[PDB]
C-alpha cells in the first residue's frame, strides 16, 4: 500500500495477508466479506490487490468469474480511453491501459508513479472498483435464498424474522429504491397473522424500531 | 483514522477490524460494547466508521435500525444547516450535508479536508455521535430485564444482588437524576428482609461501600 | 495516551484494550491487577482511563463503588481548588474542576492542553491516582482472608505458609509500619511447633531468607 | 528487506518468518503458495530470500530441485553478462555474477549497494524471478491430477465441477492461449449429459457466469 | 523504557508485560528466567522494573526476599554515597539515594533526568543489577538438586546425564573456578563404570565434545 | 539489534525472544534451526546473541559444547590479534579481545561503538560466525542417521527416498565437492532395483528433476 504528508510506498503486511486468507476460508462469499476486503486494501496498488486475489486457494470458479469481470471492465476502459501513439516526454508518464490498471502489464514503479502524480491517476481505486463489482456479482450468485420466500414462522419471534429478512435483502440485486419498496411492501405482508394485524394497525409510515417494539411481546 | 503535530491519515488496522468483529460476535449488544466501539474508532473518518459498521455480519435488524437513526440525525443536521448555493472558491471546501457526514456522499479526501481544516469541521466525531445514539437505542431495546424486577433472593449474597441491580441499571433508559432516584429508592426497598432491616438502620445517606460492608456477613 | 521530545497524543491500542479486558476477566480484583492497570495506562488521558473503566462488563458493584470514590476525590479537589470567575485570556486555559479531571466535563483537546502546558497540569496522573485509590478499596473489600487467621499446618512446608502469609498481607489495609509489625510478630508466632521452635532459636533480627533456610529441611 | 523517500534496509520480521514457515508446513506446494511467498518477500535482498528458503525443514527433494534451477539461471546470467577484468574505481561497484545475485558470493552490503544505486541493479527481484520459476516447476511436478481427466459426475453440481476444473487448470503447464483453448474446448465437453446439452444450447461465446447460471438449477 | 540518537522515553508494552507474566507463570524460578527478565527490561527505568516485579501474582515469599535483598543493596549504596545537604542549583539534579534508585522515592521525571544526563547516572541498570542479584539468590534457594548427587544411571545415555549435570551446575552457587573444578572432577567421577573407564582412557585434557563422542555408542 | 541512514541501537523484541525459544523447544537441533537463528539475530550485538543463547532452558550439554567452541574461537582471535599496551586516545576505542567479541568482558556501549565506527569493527557478525560454527558441530553430533545407510525401500516412492537422502545429506559434515560426489555416486546406487535400472538408463549427467520424472510412475 501507499501511505510530512508525502505518499510513500509500503509492502503488504503478514497480518493483512493472514486476515484476508482467514476471512475467505471462514465466510466464503457472505456479504460482509466485501467491506472487509475493502478494509484490508486501503491504499493498495494493483500489485497488492492481485496479491490478495491470488493468495486465495480454492473457490477457483468464483476467481475465474472475477477475472472475466475485470477483463470486461478493462476492455470498457480501453474503449473510453484510447491511447495516443508517441514517445513519452521527460516529466510525464504513459497513460495506463486496462491491463495496466489491472496490474498485469504495469510494474510496481509505474503504479507508484500514477498514484503519486499531480494530478493523481488512481489506478488502485479504479481496479478496486472493478474487483468489488465482480465480488458483488459473486455474492449475489452464491446467495441461497430469495427475498420473496422470507416468511415469518407461526412461533418465530419478530426479531429473528427481521434478521433473516434484512440479511437476504443485503444479498439481493436491487437499487436502493427497489429495496425501499421491498421493505415497505414485503416485510409486513409476510409476517405471521398476529404480528401482521398489529403492524397493519401501526400505519404506513412506521419505523423499524416502532414495528419491532409493537410485536415485541408477541 | 487520523493521528511535529500535523494530523495525517492512516488506514484502519487488521487488529482493529478483528477486535471489533470479535467483540460483536461474542457480546452482541451488551452495554460495554459501546465504549469498546468508541475505543476502536478514535480519530476515525466516516469511511472508517462505515467500515466497522459494514463488516458486521448478522444482527441485520439492529444494523437497519442504526441506519434509520443515522438518517434521522442527518435529516436534522440538514434542517439546522441549510446549504448555500454557489461555486466553491479556492482556499475553501463545500460545507457538508447530512449524507456527507455519514460518509455516503463524500470522498475520503473531502473528509480529510474537513477534519484537518482550521477551524476544524469534525465530521468523524459527529457521525460517531449519531452512531453511538443509535447503538444506545439498540442496547436498551435488547435488554432482557427491567430495573423494577431486580429483587434480592432469600439466600443471595448482597454483592451479587448489587451486581445484577447495577448491570440492569446500566442498560436502562434514564437520565442521571432518574438513576439517582432508582438507586436511592429501589436498591434498599428490593433487598431481602434481613439486609433490608440492616440497610434501613444505616440511614438515608449511606454510601454503597457502607451498605455492602453492613450486609457483608449476612 | 501521550508519548525530538515533544509530547504528542496517540489513540489507545487494541492490544492494550484486550489486555486490560482479559486481566479483569481472569483475575477479578486480585492485588496484582492494580499495577497491571497502572502499566496499561502509562501516559493516559482521562478519556483513556474512562475507556478502560467503561469497557469492563460485569462487576458493576465494584465499578459503582469506584464511581463514588472518584466523586469524593473530585469534591475534595473542588474544595481545595476554588474556581475564579472571569474570561479566559489568549495564551491560557481554564483551570480544571474535579469533573474535568475525571474526564466527564472536559474534552480531549482540553485534556491534551492541560497535560502539555508549561508548567504541566497532569490531570491524567491525578485521575489515575484517584482510580487506584478506589481500586485499592475494592481489593481490600473483596479479600476473602484476614492476616490473623494465616497459620501453618502441621505438615505444611514453610515456603507455602509464607506464600499464603504474604499474599494475604499484600491484600491488607495497613501502613508499612503496621506491616513490619505483622511480619515481626505474627509470622513466627503462627508457625507450627517445630518450625516455631527453630525460628525462635534464630533470634529477633532474622531475615526471611535465613528463616526459610532454617525451616527448609523441616 | 529494503523499504523522505530514501531506500533503507530492514531485517526480516518474526511474523514474516513464521508466516512463511506455517504456509509451507500446511499447504506444501499448492499453487497459492507462490503468490504468498512473493507477498512475504516484497523488497527482499538475496539474503532474505535465502533465509526464507533455508528455514524450510523437510521437502528437501523440492528444495534441491530449486537449487538446481537457480544454478541453471545463474549460469545463463553469466553467459549473457560476461565479467570485465579490472580494478573497481571509486564511485562504482563490481558488476554481479550469477552467484552474487543468488546471495552465495555477495555480502549484505554489496546487495544493498546494487539495489540502491542509480541506476538500480535489482538483484533481489532477479533472484526472486529465478526462485519463482523453480517453484512453478515444483508445483507442476507435484500436482496429482491432469486437466484431461476432470469430468463432471452424474449428480455433481456444476459449481463444484468448475472448481475442480480451474484448480487443476491453475496447476497446469500451459501458456495463456493453451489455457483459453482448454477452457473453450474441455469444460463443456466433459460436463455431464444434461449440463452438456444446456451449455451447447448456450452458444460458443458464453461467459462463465452465463454457463453457471444456466446449469444452476440442474 | 528509554530508547537522530537522542534518548527518549517510552511506556512499557502489553507484549512485554504479558511475556514476563507468562514466563513467571510457566517456569517459576528456573535459571533461564533471569536472562529472559533481563531481555524484557532492556533500557527500563526503575518504574518499569517495579512494574514487572509488582505484576507477579503469587510467589510472594520470593518477592518478599527480593524486597529484602533490594533494601540491603540500597542501604549499602547509601553507606557508600552519602548525600550532601544544600539547595540544588539550576542545571543540576539531586544525587539519588538507595530508595531513589529502587524507584520508591523518585518520580518518573527524575529517573529520566538521571538516565539522560551527561554524564549519565544509570539508575535503571543499577536497580536491575540489584534485582538480578536477588533473583539469583532465589533461583539457588529453590533448586531441588545438588551437584554432588548427579550420577549417571547404569543404562542412561551419556548425553542425558551431561544434560542433568550442567542444568544442576547452572543452578549452583559457585564462582567460575569452582565450576571448572566441578567439571574437571565430578563429571567423569560420577559416570557409570563403562563410560568412566572410557573417559579415564581419554585423558585429563579432554573436551566435552570428545567425551560425548567417546561414550556415544556406549 | 542495530538498525536518514544512521545506525541506531534497539532492544530485542518479545516476538524475537518467543520465536527463538519456541523454535528451540519444538525442533531441538534440526538443521533448519541454524538459519532461523541467523534470521532472528540480524544486526544483533554480542549482548543480544548472549541473550538468545542464555534464554534456552535445557539442552545444557549442547550449550556447554557451544561455550567451549566459542572459547576456542576467541583464543584463536587473541592469537591472531595481539593487544597493544597503551592509553586509548580521544577519538579512538580499545581494540577488542576474544572475550570482548563474545560479550562477556565488554559493555553494550563498547559494542555499539565498535559496530558503528568508521571503519566498522563488526563484533556482532564475528561472534555470530563463531556461534553458527558451534551450532553446526552440535547439529552434526545429534544427527541420528548416516548418508551411507539411506536406501530406497522396495515399495517406497522415489520422492520420499530422495527426501530422506537430502535431509540426511543436509545434516552431514562434508564440503560441497564431497556432497556432489555423494549425490553423483550414492543416490542412484542405493535406489531400489527398478528405479536403479531406469536411472542408470538415464545417463551420468541427469538432473534431479529428470530422475524424479523418470521414476515417477514407478
Ligand atoms: Cl479458501
Ligand atoms: Cl458463499
Ligand atoms: Cl497466481
Ligand atoms: Cl484517471
Ligand atoms: Cl477515473
Ligand atoms: Cl427461506
Ligand atoms: Cl421479538
Ligand atoms: Cl456477528
Ligand atoms: Cl444483545
Ligand atoms: Cl456493505
Ligand atoms: Cl461544524
Ligand atoms: Cl458540530
Ligand atoms: Cl430478573
Ligand atoms: Cl456479600
Ligand atoms: Cl469482566
Ligand atoms: Cl476479587
Ligand atoms: Cl459507558
Ligand atoms: Cl496541578
Ligand atoms: Cl497536583
Ligand atoms: Cl486461611
Ligand atoms: Cl520449605
Ligand atoms: Cl515443512
Ligand atoms: Cl504439494
Ligand atoms: Cl542452510
Ligand atoms: Cl541489471
Ligand atoms: Cl535485469
Ligand atoms: Cl480427477
Ligand atoms: Cl451449481
Ligand atoms: Cl505467577
Ligand atoms: Cl522454582
Ligand atoms: Cl503493588
Ligand atoms: Cl553513578
Ligand atoms: Cl554505578
Ligand atoms: Cl538427582
Ligand atoms: Cl549419548
Ligand atoms: Cl528447550
Ligand atoms: Cl536434535
Ligand atoms: Cl545466564
Ligand atoms: Cl575487525
Ligand atoms: Cl574480521
Ligand atoms: Cl535410515
Ligand atoms: Cl515418486
Residue numbers in the entry:
A (entry chain A), B (entry chain A), C (entry chain A), D (entry chain A), E (entry chain A), F (entry chain A): 1 to 3, 7 to 221
Give the text the authors published on this PDB structure:
HIV-1 capsid protein (CA) plays critical roles in both early and late stages of the viral replication cycle. CA consists of 231 amino acids that fold into two distinct domains, the N-terminal domain (CANTD) and the C-terminal domain (CACTD), connected by a short linker. Multiple copies of CA monomers assemble around the viral genome to form the characteristic cone-shaped structure of the mature HIV-1 capsid core. The core is composed of ∼200 hexamers and precisely 12 pentamers.
CA residues R18, E28, and K30 are highly conserved among known HIV-1 isolates. They are at opposite ends of the N-terminal domain interface (or NDI) pocket formed by the ends of two symmetry-related helices (R18 and E28 in H1 and K30′ in H1′) from neighboring CAs within a pentameric or hexameric unit. R18 is at the “top” of the pocket, whereas E28 and K30′ are at the “floor”. Indeed, this area has a higher concentration of pentamers, which have been suggested to be less stable than hexamers due to the tighter positioning and greater electrostatic repulsion of the arginine 18 residues that form a tight ring at the center of hexamers and pentamers. In contrast, interactions at the top of the pocket (R18) appear to be more important at intrahexameric interfaces, consistent with the loss of hexamer-containing tubes observed in our TEM studies with R18A. On the basis of the data, it is likely that both parts of the NDI pocket contribute to stabilization during assembly.
